[PDB]
Design a protein around this ligand. Structure first.
Ligand SMILES: CC/C=C\C/C=C\C/C=C\C/C=C\C/C=C\C/C=C\CCC(=O)O[C@H](COC(=O)CCCCCCCCCCCCCCC)COP(=O)(O)OCCN
Ligand SMILES: CC/C=C\C/C=C\C/C=C\C/C=C\C/C=C\C/C=C\CCC(=O)O[C@H](COC(=O)CCCCCCCCCCCCCCC)COP(=O)(O)OCCN
Ligand SMILES: CCCCCCCC/C=C\CCCCCCCC(=O)O[C@H](COC(=O)CCCCCCCCCCCCCCC)COP(=O)([O-])OCC[N+](C)(C)C
Ligand SMILES: CCCCCCCC/C=C\CCCCCCCC(=O)O[C@H](COC(=O)CCCCCCCCCCCCCCC)COP(=O)([O-])OCC[N+](C)(C)C
Ligand SMILES: CCCCCCCC/C=C\CCCCCCCC(=O)O[C@H](COC(=O)CCCCCCCCCCCCCCC)COP(=O)(O)OCCN
Ligand SMILES: CCCCCCCC/C=C\CCCCCCCC(=O)O[C@H](COC(=O)CCCCCCCCCCCCCCC)COP(=O)(O)OCCN
Ligand SMILES: CCCCCCCC/C=C\CCCCCCCC(=O)O[C@H](COC(=O)CCCCCCCCCCCCCCC)COP(=O)(O)OCCN
Ligand SMILES: CCCCCCCC/C=C\CCCCCCCC(=O)O[C@H](COC(=O)CCCCCCCCCCCCCCC)COP(=O)(O)OCCN
Ligand SMILES: CCCCCCCC/C=C\CCCCCCCC(=O)O[C@H](COC(=O)CCCCCCCCCCCCCCC)COP(=O)(O)OCCN
Ligand SMILES: CCCCCCCC/C=C\CCCCCCCC(=O)O[C@H](COC(=O)CCCCCCCCCCCCCCC)COP(=O)(O)OCCN
Ligand SMILES: CC(C)CCC[C@@H](C)[C@H]1CC[C@H]2[C@@H]3CC=C4C[C@@H](O)CC[C@]4(C)[C@H]3CC[C@]12C
Ligand SMILES: CC(C)CCC[C@@H](C)[C@H]1CC[C@H]2[C@@H]3CC=C4C[C@@H](O)CC[C@]4(C)[C@H]3CC[C@]12C
Ligand SMILES: *[C@@H]1O[C@H](CO)[C@@H](O)[C@H](O)[C@H]1NC(C)=O
Ligand SMILES: *[C@@H]1O[C@H](CO)[C@@H](O)[C@H](O)[C@H]1NC(C)=O
Ligand code: NA
Ligand code: NA
Lengths: 579, 579
């Protein structure tokens, strides 16, 4: 169709693989914090300028859909205004200016050159190569339009901090615009357009290889440097500052994507239907871009909200990969037939399993070698992780067994749904020990729950939906490998664990009890979607009211459970003694 | 034909422009020496491994001309053996093993991935893309074959330094091979061939973008890092160690290129004539590759001959650009008709003028702002540089005036040959003041020689060959813009300066008198070629005995004089106070 979603997963693997290489290099100490500066300087003062110059010089500027650009700039203006006003309305006067300045820059400025451009190039370079040029229009125009306002609030604050009796409103405003004009993304785009007109959009051949060679080294080096700078940045923040972060990231990864797409459809009236739709979806995906790291550099320069801005920028980077993936697949479902669409949910389930298995193997070795698994609640956690790991293996073979070897597909599906009910039940069991932690005097009982209930109940549930003989389901989805019975036993397996975890968590109100409630709290948001899908189907069989879409989110959660545990427990430092 | 020489100049501009960007960044202190380590680690442990892996995995290995590879490996074996034996025959016993170990590694190991591959890709990706794959065969096979021998000599030396009474010949040999096997160029090429067979030469699609993105960032980042590491490396070496360097660099930039080409023709009997010739010339250009910086890393690790190896590696890098350029153009002349061949010597003259002018403008500002120009012999030098600068302007317009505006071409040619005789005469005048420096009590006489002879004699000489009225020469070469008279006056202008400089230099036997004799000594090697060409022609008019080839070297020297002065006097540190 219009978007090459198939090419999206490898593009994400590239983008976030190189980021992870940089993170590992910085954690392994292969490159120290002082040494990472060299890579940053080369990418910011050489690789980036060359890329921007070259792309501005060739930009036709006579075939650019300014309406599409107008609608992205309008969406970002709207998010900037909302966040800034809300911050100025609830932030204490002392940090009101600093927060009203940086917050809306955080919520609108996105990682367009390093992360956005490879994803756009994968999705569009064959269908809509014209979409690529926008990256070099939107990002600098937005910097120019909106960053001066934020820097003006930050300078307004600096004045309060200095308590300077004098007043320099004009000077404050020139300090803001001057900070903007010294950004290479701005003055290099200026020089590049000047030479677009002088060189007549023709890069001098003699300098062409130099420009290509310097700009072709921007992407990998910048993604690697990104990884290096996310080392050690998430510091322990108060719940208040933790709510602020959730609100800030949501505005950039949710409100902006929705607004961008609504703006396009609102002011785009092109007479193609497929082209209006391709442009709307490109606007959504643009808005899903992660927060630019230059924002944390601004916060450092101004020395304001450094910890919250940097924590948020790192968290946003991590979180955008699942959201871009899932959003891009969801925007393609209206355009597919009911059969290629079930073959796509398997494609997606397979991709999530790939990355979830590697995340889980890492988190499992970390717990084992650290020996943290032999203490609670990490002992229960090390059980949920094992259950999640099994799933990712069964799914990656269920796609290789669906509609094949009905017999040998009774096991792969069984080892797929005992474990998967085990992960549903282990989520609930875990929130009990967290509650039992309050009753420390009361020694917990891992025995009888570690396996008797941990996997024994889940395993028995599969037998309940397996008693049927020769009931092998050619259904492309193991969820429908059986009749309503599978939906039933899955809807009630979910009901115990939904209430177990809920009541226990509320009743509950380095043991790491803070991160663990953060786990269960995220795992319950999943148990909500699957429970809804099972009952929703058990009400209107084969429902069409956004059900398949819900059937898709239940696949991402079922085989994405491990990746969640990874972000919580796989990056944690552990004393793993090989000897 | 077979080589795209036209595409060679832009490729060199890319390769050495990025190197110069890195050098400038390191001199301007944009990236410090500790910060440059980060870029090096990323390129060596990530960008390089990915590139090698990817290229080995896809290598067919069933369409590789092993005979061509055999002949390059044989030429390098031969140079390694010659240098090692000569070092073991003349080096004092104390450093004999260290020098016999590192010297032949220096003379054979070349900068194939960072510098070689873009040049090969420019010259060949359209005519012979099969030539590119060799870069990834020759370089690692050579590392494996020849580096263990050198590391064995270095370990043999370490033992003498430790004076360990015990003897571990086997252990010494395993230490050498172990050092070789830990080089990523070796074990990554191993892994890549293993997976060439396992993956059946098919890189997994899911990892393909990751591999391309990491390996596509190798070239620019590695050239930039190269530039950064050449900052401050040329230390003051004794004449002895200075002769050693000239011999070592000549073996790698001259003997190896000649041997490589002779080996190919010797053991290549393919039935195409154009293909045998294209392969011979590709072998020459391979051998002209600069010394790999990994060799200086070996010398650091072993802590042996660090200063000479690093100085030599930096000097070799600088020197290889003119040699690769000129060699590649010379290998194409047999294949061109007498008219496209005169239009090619103008092409070359134009390219050298481009880079010589920028080099001269830099060296001129450095002398002016430093105020060094107002002292001798820098005062005479600042005059020769000005004369060289004029030339580069007249040539870059002579190509735009040749066979055009006969009248307005009488000036461009005149301003081309007064200055050019001025550069010939200023070389001689300069070697006089260097001689006069010995007679310090004898105050020099810049007056009467600064302009009266510096440009007055040269200007009068042009009038001598200009007295002819309406003698405008449509000749594509300003050298033939006039009859034998131009060749005559040019042959005698050269004769004074050849003997002036010679007698004065011999009679002569921060004034910087060491670098200045190094200038005149190099400028006289040029005055030898032009003088020979003029007399050679004045003997056999329009001679065909390698004359045009000599006519080509006189063009490179005439418009390349500034670049020479740049490498001597443009990189020198100077106190330029703008205020
Ligand atoms: C659900 C899965 C579904 C689909 C996925 C499918 C496809 C995705 C595509 C490609 C996969 C590639 C990579 C995945 C993402 C990032 C890895 C790269 C670098 C790690 C840097 C890091 O590790 O960066 C760290 C900062 O990220 C953190 O912490 C993590 C915080 C994240 C929140 C915690 C929950 C985990 C899951 C997140 C999803 C939540 C919402 C999802 C929406 C659907 C820096 O760690 P520190 O050293 O600062 O501290 C370290 C702790 N001590
Ligand atoms: C002749 C011209 C003809 C044709 C040219 C045509 C095309 C060439 C193609 C592209 C041009 C691009 C770049 C030219 C080369 C290098 C520039 C890059 C980086 C500079 C690094 C540096 O600057 O690297 C320096 C180490 O190179 C040195 O010194 C320089 C020593 C070189 C020898 C001195 C003579 C100058 C000319 C060389 C030619 C000699 C033989 C030519 C054969 C034909 C490191 O300087 P340091 O800071 O260590 O010390 C600094 C001093 N205080
Ligand atoms: C004239 C107009 C042309 C168009 C505009 C050009 C735009 C090009 C755009 C992009 C091209 C590449 C730009 C990268 C460098 C400049 C941008 C920048 O801000 O970086 C600067 C480095 O700047 C440098 O160091 C200079 C390096 C340039 C060397 C060129 C080599 C030859 C290549 C030519 C190839 C072929 C040429 C053949 C000729 C025909 C960063 O330095 P800095 O940190 O800011 O300063 C120090 C500050 N502190 C930290 C010390 C305080
Ligand atoms: C299994 C076999 C496969 C084939 C072989 C692979 C070969 C690949 C070849 C090249 C690929 C890239 C190689 C670059 C790193 C490895 C080489 C190396 O020596 O570097 C090392 C870093 O190594 C790392 O840090 C690891 C980083 C890897 C992260 C991958 C991200 C996901 C991408 C997957 C994309 C999609 C995947 C989808 C899945 C379907 C350097 O570290 P070190 O300095 O030596 O150690 C520390 C030593 N001191 C200094 C501290 C003492
Ligand atoms: C879509 C349109 C959005 C409109 C309504 C969105 C709902 C959120 C609105 C307001 C919630 C803001 C307050 C949340 C909790 C803040 C707690 C708080 O008071 O901290 C204050 C933090 O408040 C701020 O600094 C600004 C608050 C966040 C600024 C941006 C607000 C988010 C706007 C975008 C949210 C959009 C998505 C939300 C729903 C999906 C700091 O001052 P202090 O507490 O007095 O001093 C102690 C230092 N922390
Ligand atoms: C979370 C687990 C279970 C929940 C299942 C849904 C999860 C959604 C998560 C967060 C809230 C995002 C929902 C956005 C709703 C906007 C839908 C919309 O209006 O798009 C309409 C149609 O949209 C489409 O074309 C396809 C639907 C997808 C749109 C949203 C796609 C991305 C949102 C999901 C990604 C968010 C987080 C995902 C990460 C796992 C536009 O037409 P309309 O006439 O204006 O409205 C039609 C409604 N009858
Ligand atoms: C064959 C096709 C793909 C195969 C698998 C691709 C993914 C492989 C990912 C990682 C493999 C290498 C991971 C560890 C290598 C080095 C570990 C290391 O030493 O750093 C350690 C820290 O490194 C880390 O923590 C890295 C954390 C993540 C590593 C593995 C993550 C799993 C991937 C999940 C993300 C999804 C992407 C999937 C990509 C396929 C030790 O640091 P420390 O504890 O602070 O103290 C310093 C002690 N040296
Ligand atoms: C093409 C086949 C080449 C064969 C003949 C090439 C002519 C060069 C042959 C021998 C010249 C070698 C000696 C030149 C000057 C060396 C002065 C010298 O004695 O220093 C000695 C330096 O000698 C060495 O270390 C090794 C000499 C250079 C090693 C490599 C020799 C170059 C071989 C390749 C040359 C090929 C091109 C030459 C002609 C274009 C050091 O020992 P020391 O002086 O006793 O202690 C004081 C510390 N320097
Ligand atoms: C230096 C200023 C004035 C001097 C003018 C010449 C400068 C040469 C510089 C250094 C010595 C390099 C000379 C290499 C001579 C090898 C020629 C050769 O054998 O190639 C023969 C033919 O060669 C050709 O096809 C074209 C000639 C070019 C070959 C050498 C090309 C590169 C050498 C020049 C580059 C060296 C430094 C240049 C940097 C400015 C092979 O056939 P043969 O039957 O074996 O011999 C035929 C002889 N009648
Ligand atoms: C428009 C098409 C091409 C236009 C021209 C392209 C070539 C432009 C080359 C260079 C322009 C920038 C050169 C200087 C920029 C910064 C100078 C600087 O501050 O670094 C200075 C050191 O930098 C240098 O020394 C660089 C030396 C070479 C610079 C220019 C070389 C001319 C090019 C000749 C090579 C041929 C390549 C030709 C490429 C077209 C100061 O360092 P310091 O004295 O040790 O003390 C530190 C005080 N800050
Ligand atoms: C849903 C999309 C479209 C908008 C993004 C909202 C969600 C995905 C983002 C907004 C704030 C993010 C959270 C903020 C902070 C933390 C704590 C940190 O340790 C990682 C997990 C967690 C919990 C992040 C998970 C994802 C998160 C909740
Ligand atoms: C001619 C080719 C094919 C072989 C290479 C030999 C020449 C070009 C190389 C070999 C050693 C080099 C010299 C060695 C050392 C110095 C001193 C240093 O300050 C730069 C100039 C100078 C003088 C270099 C100029 C070029 C050089 C003479
Ligand atoms: C729709 O997009 C396609 C793809 O680039 C383009 O060729 C076509 O002109 C567009 N149609 C309209 C009506 O703009
Ligand atoms: C000569 O080289 C060309 C260019 O690749 C190739 O197509 C041709 O097969 C070669 N000829 C012979 C006889 O090998
Ligand atoms: Na980011
Ligand atoms: Na080199």
């Amino acid at each position: 169709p219009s978007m090459s979603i198939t090419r999206l997963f490898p593009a994400l693997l590239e983008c976030f693989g190189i980021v992870l290489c940089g993170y590992i290099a910085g954690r392994a100490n292969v490159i120290t914090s002082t040494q990472a500066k060299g890579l940053g300087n080369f990418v910011s003062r050489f690789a980036l300028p060359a890329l921007l110059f070259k792309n501005m010089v060739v930009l036709n500027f006579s075939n650019v859909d300014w309406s599409f650009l107008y609608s992205i700039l309008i969406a970002k203006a709207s998010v900037f205004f909302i966040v800034c006003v809300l911050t100025l309305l609830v932030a204490s006067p002392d940090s009101r200016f600093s927060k009203a300045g940086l917050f809306p820059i955080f919520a609108t400025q996105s990682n367009d050159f390093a992360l956005g451009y490879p994803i756009v190039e994968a999705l569009y370079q064959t269908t809509y190569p014209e979409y690529l040029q926008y990256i070099y229009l939107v990002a600098p125009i937005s910097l120019m339009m909106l960053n001066p306002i934020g820097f003006i609030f930050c300078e307004i604050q600096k004045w309060k901090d200095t308590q300077n009796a004098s007043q320099n409103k004009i000077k404050i405003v020139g300090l803001g615009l001057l900070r903007v004009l010294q950004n290479p993304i701005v003055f290099m785009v200026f020089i590049g357009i000047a030479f677009n007109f002088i060189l007549d959009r023709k890069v001098p051949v003699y300098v062409e290889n130099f420009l290509d060679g310097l700009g072709n080294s921007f992407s990998g080096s910048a993604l690697f440097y990104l990884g290096l700078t996310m080392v050690g940045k998430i510091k322990r923040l108060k719940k208040s500052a933790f709510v602020v972060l959730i609100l800030l990231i949501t505005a950039k990864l949710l409100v902006l994507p929705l607004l961008c797409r609504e703006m396009v459809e609102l002011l785009d009236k092109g007479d193609s239907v497929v082209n209006h739709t391709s442009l709307s979806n490109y606007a959504f995906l643009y808005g899903v871009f992660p927060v630019a790291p230059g924002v944390a550099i601004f916060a450092t320069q101004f020395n304001m909200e450094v910890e919250i801005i940097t924590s948020g920028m790192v968290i946003s980077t991590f979180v955008s990969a699942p959201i871009m993936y899932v959003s891009a697949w969801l925007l393609t479902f209206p355009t597919m037939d009911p059969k290629p669409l079930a073959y796509a949910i398997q494609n997606v389930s397979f991709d999530i399993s790939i990355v979830s298995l590697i995340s889980l193997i890492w988190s499992l070795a970390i717990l084992l070698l650290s020996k943290k698994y032999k203490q609670l609640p990490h002992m229960l956690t090390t059980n949920l992780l094992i259950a999640q790991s099994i799933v990712c293996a069964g799914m990656m073979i269920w796609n290789f067994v669906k509609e094949k070897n009905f017999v040998g597909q009774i096991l792969v599906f069984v080892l797929l749904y005992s474990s998967l009910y085990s992960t549903y039940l282990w989520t609930g069991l875990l929130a009990i020990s967290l509650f039992l932690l309050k009753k420390r005097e009361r020694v917990q009982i891992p025995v009888g729950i570690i396996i008797i209930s941990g996997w024994g109940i889940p395993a028995l549930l599969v037998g309940v939906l397996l008693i049927t003989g020769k009931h092998n389901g050619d259904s492309i989805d193991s969820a429908f490998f059986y009749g309503k019975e599978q939906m039933i036993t899955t809807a009630v397996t979910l009901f115990c664990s939904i209430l177990i975890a809920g009541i226990s968590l509320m009743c509950m109100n380095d043991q790491q009890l803070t991160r663990h409630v953060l786990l269960c709290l995220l795992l319950i948001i999943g148990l909500f979607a699957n429970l809804s899908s099972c009952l929703w189907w058990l009400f209107n069989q084969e429902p069409g009211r956004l059900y398949v879409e819900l059937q898709f989110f239940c696949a991402v959660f079922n085989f994405g459970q491990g990746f969640i545990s990874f972000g919580i427990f796989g990056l944690d430092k552990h004393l793993i003694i090989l000897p």
